[PDB]
Amino acid sequence: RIVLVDNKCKCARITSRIIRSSEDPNEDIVERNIRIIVPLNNRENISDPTSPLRTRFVYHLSDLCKKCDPTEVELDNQIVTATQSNICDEATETCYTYDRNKCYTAVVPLVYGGETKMVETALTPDACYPD
Amino acid sequence: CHPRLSLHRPALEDLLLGSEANLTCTLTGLRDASGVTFTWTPSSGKSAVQGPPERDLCGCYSVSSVLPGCAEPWNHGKTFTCTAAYPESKTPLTATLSKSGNTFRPEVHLLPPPSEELALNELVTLTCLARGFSPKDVLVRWLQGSQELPREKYLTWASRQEPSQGTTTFAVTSILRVAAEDWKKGDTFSCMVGHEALPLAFTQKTIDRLAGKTHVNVSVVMAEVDGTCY
Amino acid sequence: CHPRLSLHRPALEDLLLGSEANLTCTLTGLRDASGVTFTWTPSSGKSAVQGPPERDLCGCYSVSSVLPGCAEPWNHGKTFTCTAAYPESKTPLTATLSKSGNTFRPEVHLLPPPSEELALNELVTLTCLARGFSPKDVLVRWLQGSQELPREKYLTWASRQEPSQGTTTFAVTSILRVAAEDWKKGDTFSCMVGHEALPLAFTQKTIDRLAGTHVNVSVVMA
Amino acid sequence: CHPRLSLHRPALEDLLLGSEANLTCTLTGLRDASGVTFTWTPSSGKSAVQGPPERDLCGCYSVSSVLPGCAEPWNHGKTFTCTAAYPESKTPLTATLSKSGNTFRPEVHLLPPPSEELALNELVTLTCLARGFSPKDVLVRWLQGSQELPREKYLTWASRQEPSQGTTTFAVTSILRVAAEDWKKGDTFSCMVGHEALPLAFTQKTIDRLAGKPTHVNVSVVMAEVDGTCY
Amino acid sequence: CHPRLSLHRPALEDLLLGSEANLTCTLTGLRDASGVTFTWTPSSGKSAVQGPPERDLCGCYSVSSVLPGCAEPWNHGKTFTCTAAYPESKTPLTATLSKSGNTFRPEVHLLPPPSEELALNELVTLTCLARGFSPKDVLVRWLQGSQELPREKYLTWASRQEPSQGTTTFAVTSILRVAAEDWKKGDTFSCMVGHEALPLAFTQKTIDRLAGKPTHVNVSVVM
Amino acid sequence: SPIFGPEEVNSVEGNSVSITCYYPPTSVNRHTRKYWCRQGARGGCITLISSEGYVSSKYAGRANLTNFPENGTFVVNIAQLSQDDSGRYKCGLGINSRGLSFDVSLEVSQGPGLLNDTKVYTVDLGRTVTINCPFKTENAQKRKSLYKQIGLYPVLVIDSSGYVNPNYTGRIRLDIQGTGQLLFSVVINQLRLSDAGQYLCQAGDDSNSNKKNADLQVLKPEPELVYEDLRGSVTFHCALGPEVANVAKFLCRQSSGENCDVVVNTLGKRAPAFEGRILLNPQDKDGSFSVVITGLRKEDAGRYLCGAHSDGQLQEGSPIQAWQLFVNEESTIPRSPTVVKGVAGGSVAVLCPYNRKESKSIKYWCLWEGAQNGRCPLLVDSEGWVKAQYEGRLSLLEEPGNGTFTVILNQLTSRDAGFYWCLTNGDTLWRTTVEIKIIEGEPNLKVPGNVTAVLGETLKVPCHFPCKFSSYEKYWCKWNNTGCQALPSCDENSRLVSLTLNLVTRADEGWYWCGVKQGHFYGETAAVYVAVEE
């Protein structure tokens, strides 16, 4: 199998495979498999008081498969950099899940003595360490 | 009585919410006056203060001393020593302490109200449990929405160690009573726990009236399926 | 140091399960003078036992005493007065203790385990909470099925005072960690709380699995 | 016929792949002779190559002029102000051209082959379509694997303007015919488009048979009461 | 300027749909008077008054002829040539007229919209493509339902020639942008191509949603 | 999937065991929870020991678990094993129900004891063994014989009169030495896997017949686990004994259907896929040697064997040594260009990366040579040595400096094509290889040819450049061993950056370079030699 996309902001995985046929070669078979993981316990925006549970999930194929990173092409005798999509609007996407390799913090005001301080919390405590 | 000397670690509310992490050295059971003299091993800008005497158990003088500016040597892991000397002595005492090792990170659980309290429709009770952390010190705070509640509105017990299934760990609880109008309307509540082994010194968890599932509805659409993935 | 007399109520564990409860009138801060004379004034029932001295606060001869057999006149609602004798003043000592009133019964809850613990396939945690009782003394016991568990297998906190507005009430918690496969079998667990206000002296609740879930999903695919 | 002057903007291919932003000034329809004059305001390259006095059909003689330059200045917004002093006027005549404003980057699509062309097993057609860009000039290339195909293997049209959804935009097309044994095997093809309004001035799109229309799809939804982390 | 003389063909938009298909014998560039006598070597019996006797661009005079009262029925394919006259040096000029062979019928394909456009719901794009015909003369007309669309709501390109293996052939494209609600509702669209070589001179295609039927999805959910 | 460990683990009762599992050294993985679990017939791991302080009931006192974040490993130690510990287990990180795990099988079997009536013998596959057998004093000249007990029946393999079985031709011998010895020995060289079982001696047909039944086990070699990355490198150490120091060596790779495909020999062999990226070093006093493979790909993973046999392949009866390789694919090695194109007379500039922590080391640059077993000599280093054939056309610069250095090579020819390696003195060692191709064209910068100068006269040299280099920086420099340094400021429009030399003694002789750069990243250069006459 060949991995087409593996998206972590919405936790989607797409693979595909060609199975030929040596009997009248228009009965060829092309197969595509999609794997979706739906969370049921986290908010709409990722900040704590927010619309207590997301209950509607929307998956558009063209939004999952996009390649938002440049590339290098050799045209005649030079190498040029090129973009790979039309939809790379300049980051304001709503993610459905957390990412295991990224940080997510929050800011809370607390009181210590006759003052008020503004401290920072951690929502995924494994992934935020100063090293 | 018999004179003793010990060293106390700086308090956790200052290491996480302030700047001045005062470390202190004490003394108990002196007899007649205070001619006591002190020193430490580091003296990097150490403006040491001795202060006045006091009265200990049954009545006995007891003078301590404090060393300002001890945050970065503590978190870096240096070691401190304290020796005193009373005028009826030919042997200075000693004490040492350091920031501990072999630590563990607490597990925080926030529990929904029981089912019998929601029917009587007066007040409901939320519970916060922290479990499995090796040094005994911890902080617990609550939030309603985004505003912090005052400390005179909830009750939190002390930190005791739990039965052994390996290494030795500790645990703590707290409860909060809130009105059933504010709970059945859709407000959210959060519990924040602070500890040394946590990464950014604080972590939190949150709950509301929907969490705990009932028969919830979910909808998935999956709009275009065969659509040239590129 | 300085002398001080004080009494003590009988213990709570000996009222509910045991038979004979004690009643102490201790005298701390003497350092000497073994000729001390305790004498309870309603002098009937048993006979008063004196005590040998001990050490307290590096110098005190804190002598004690026990008047046994007063467990049932405690529950009926009598009143006791202790006295003593110390080698200085023109006065003896005297204190008083009696069972008070306006008591309230505890409300006990037993909570199911959280959901993030079952993912790890280790021990799971049950929590028992007792709230709203007027005298501070309480007991907590745990049961699995019908067999009782020893006291070294769980953890209870003390009973502090809770921030009420109307009248003064107290609260207490306890946790028990059991094996995950024992939970997944279908075994039942129980929490018992004993108090003075409960007439049958013990109340208990029971939790297990299958207590209360089902989701209704819909796909569209255009 | 009538003497008219014109400046001409530099070619897209030379400017994008290099910096040879050469300008071109030309008066058309001189009276009798070739003794004309030229003058630009940025006199950097004073060796402006005046071309030979060529002619044009139905009685027309024209003069050309080139002011060679580099890509740098044209992209920063200078201005160029060619002149002429042909003898049949008693006052000179100018023209001015600069870089364009109010630009839009194009939308590039690459269409899969149709169904009844695959059931003949001889050749298949790919189609690249670029739409919605404000100046009328654009580049189109093709690639197979990662090697650029020579320009004599495909067909590109011109850039017309589309009917108005308010403002003025343009569109192009190009097609490429491919042996059907190479499409069904799993080779990849690519369409590359270059234009002034793009940020990196180039954009490409790749397609193959795996990224086309499939004939069997399997969807598997998985609920998660545990957490959302996507391991 | 230098004079010349040319000859044209009847336009294709009239040959299949009208009765005003008429031919040409023009004269490009002149500075003289009426020394014109036109003679066409088939003489079926029509009326051959001249076209518009007028002028041209940049000071050139011109004459022209058309054949109004006979709609040119040359499906049999005559030679049909014009032999003009003017009082110049001793060669009154003729012209060139013919009908070549090697007629190839076109192949027309109509494409579904790109799937990126369906997710945004503003306007979708359809594309017609005609390929593989030898005479470079073709007309393209769109249809929605059965009401023809006007010629200002779509865009079509010229007719270019394509690289090939010895036999020379031509191609043409066209696009049309419609609203997303009309696509998702279920409306039908059609492309129509007219060419010389076809038996009824017009080829249709059709497309809508639910036109790719054999896709075979299969859904499953666990826990 | 990125987790790796031992697939099979064997042990006997009463003794301990130690298991190692590997993970990428990402900071999420250095602080997450590690676990050791056992799966049964219910589809779920029951955790037995954890990284957070959990020890199960069955593992109290026996086991523990340790984590080493700087390696990227964690170790599980189990003690006092028993026969009830035979089953399937998993290493892993995070939550048990996900798939960041690795499967392990474990088999325990009961040990020896009390069986004094049978002796034992265990050697390695392909080594030497000898069997010692007494034959009684009442036999001086009476037959000695061996008997192989094959299943149903006993057969004979060597008499004391010369009959030796066709299975054992040439690799068996019977010795009764002198010195008044009335025992005997049977020596076997080149042991195979088809020689296991239970033998039995004999001394004659007689009533005496001093038999003593014996065992012969043969050991397969346990593999060694190697954990590497994509586009990194690996070094194998073959360490056979001195007794095979004069035999040919090889390295093959196992496959599915019991077939080694050979990867390298000492008889001059090489696979086509490993062209340009494999070495084979000469061997030591003890016959030890090493094999270096660079630029690792996804299909480079599996079992590897190195052995010793005369024809240079894997065959029956040769000693071997095994390795197990795993390629990560979650690598932090930066994706660099692999092929670099130039034309004749042009230059090339190559970025060579390393690891950021050892920035005070010494860098080198090497050209690979085939037509041998494989060699790779130096061309230049980072302190001032350069090969004599490459004088005035090669330099190494430490210019980007965040784990990247540059190499500049101009005056290219068609001979300069090939594969080139970059090396470091550090402990961690990636070796990166780049290929140079030569194509047709004309160079960008344009300089005159060789230049003369008169004694005591000023000289001017031009260097024209195209319009695409008009936005860069330009320089002239004078080439030396330590590196070339720029000259103080002579520029114009898109042409003619000109060097000028005011007076001339012979100290101005040498090679000079004309080049462009974007601040830190270097580009094309060109060279010109300047003589001085009188």
Ligand SMILES: *[C@@H]1O[C@H](CO)[C@@H](O[C@@H]2O[C@H](CO)[C@@H](O[C@@H]3O[C@H](CO)[C@@H](O)[C@H](O)[C@@H]3O)[C@H](O)[C@H]2NC(C)=O)[C@H](O)[C@H]1NC(C)=O
């Ligand atoms: C990287 O992993 C390796 C293998 O897992 C670790 O190697 C071994 O680690 C142990 C414990 O740190 C070392 O044991 C000690 O050895 C000394 C003698 O060298 C002994 O006297 C002590 O009682 C103690 O057991 C061991 O030396 C070391 N090396 C080998 C070859 O076994 C290594 O520790 C890991 N890396 C780091 C930086 O920790």
Ligand SMILES: *[C@@H]1O[C@H](CO)[C@@H](O[C@@H]2O[C@H](CO)[C@@H](O)[C@H](O)[C@H]2NC(C)=O)[C@H](O)[C@H]1NC(C)=O
């Ligand atoms: C999601 O929640 C975050 C909470 O931090 C929002 O980010 C903040 O938005 C407020 C709005 O005025 C700003 O003042 C803060 O500076 C923002 N903080 C950060 C860290 O971005 C965010 O806007 C919310 N997003 C959505 C789509 O609701």
Ligand SMILES: *[C@@H]1O[C@H](CO)[C@@H](O[C@@H]2O[C@H](CO)[C@@H](O)[C@H](O)[C@H]2NC(C)=O)[C@H](O)[C@H]1NC(C)=O
């Ligand atoms: C832009 O102008 C320059 C200058 O004329 C052109 O360069 C000339 O190219 C021709 C053909 O190679 C040479 O014969 C001349 O010698 C060049 N002139 C100079 C001054 O170098 C260039 O060709 C023009 N534009 C493009 C894109 O070619």
Ligand SMILES: *[C@@H]1O[C@H](CO)[C@@H](O[C@@H]2O[C@H](CO)[C@@H](O)[C@H](O)[C@H]2NC(C)=O)[C@H](O)[C@H]1NC(C)=O
């Ligand atoms: C320019 O002059 C240099 C120096 O004399 C020449 O470089 C030498 O060429 C010979 C001929 O092969 C080599 O053996 C030497 O090793 C070269 N270097 C030195 C330092 O002497 C060079 O060949 C001349 N010609 C060109 C075109 O550069």
Ligand SMILES: *[C@@H]1O[C@H](CO)[C@@H](O)[C@H](O)[C@H]1NC(C)=O
């Ligand atoms: C530490 O001691 C100094 C001097 O007594 C005092 O000013 C400061 O507030 C103290 N810091 C604390 C208590 O955090």
Ligand SMILES: *[C@@H]1O[C@H](CO)[C@@H](O)[C@H](O)[C@H]1NC(C)=O
């Ligand atoms: C959701 O579930 C509830 C109970 O299961 C049902 O009454 C309701 O119709 C469902 N749908 C919506 C949209 O609420």
Ligand SMILES: *[C@@H]1O[C@H](CO)[C@@H](O)[C@H](O)[C@H]1NC(C)=O
């Ligand atoms: C008195 O109290 C002690 C401990 O508090 C207990 O062991 C004993 O049973 C009680 N009763 C008597 C009669 O001693």
Ligand SMILES: *[C@@H]1O[C@H](CO)[C@@H](O)[C@H](O)[C@H]1NC(C)=O
């Ligand atoms: C774990 O236990 C084994 C055996 O008791 C011992 O060899 C090893 O050192 C222990 N590891 C640690 C970190 O104590």
Ligand SMILES: *[C@@H]1O[C@H](CO)[C@@H](O)[C@H](O)[C@H]1NC(C)=O
């Ligand atoms: C010799 O080898 C063959 C190979 O299978 C085996 O069947 C046979 O039993 C062996 N015989 C002896 C005497 O070793």
Ligand SMILES: *[C@@H]1O[C@H](CO)[C@@H](O)[C@H](O)[C@H]1NC(C)=O
């Ligand atoms: C690159 O090097 C500079 C200079 O030392 C340094 O400040 C910077 O942090 C480095 N960048 C990285 C990503 O290490």
Ligand SMILES: *[C@@H]1O[C@H](CO)[C@@H](O)[C@H](O)[C@H]1NC(C)=O
């Ligand atoms: C340049 O090279 C010469 C001769 O090799 C040497 O003597 C001199 O020191 C070098 N200068 C520098 C700056 O490296």
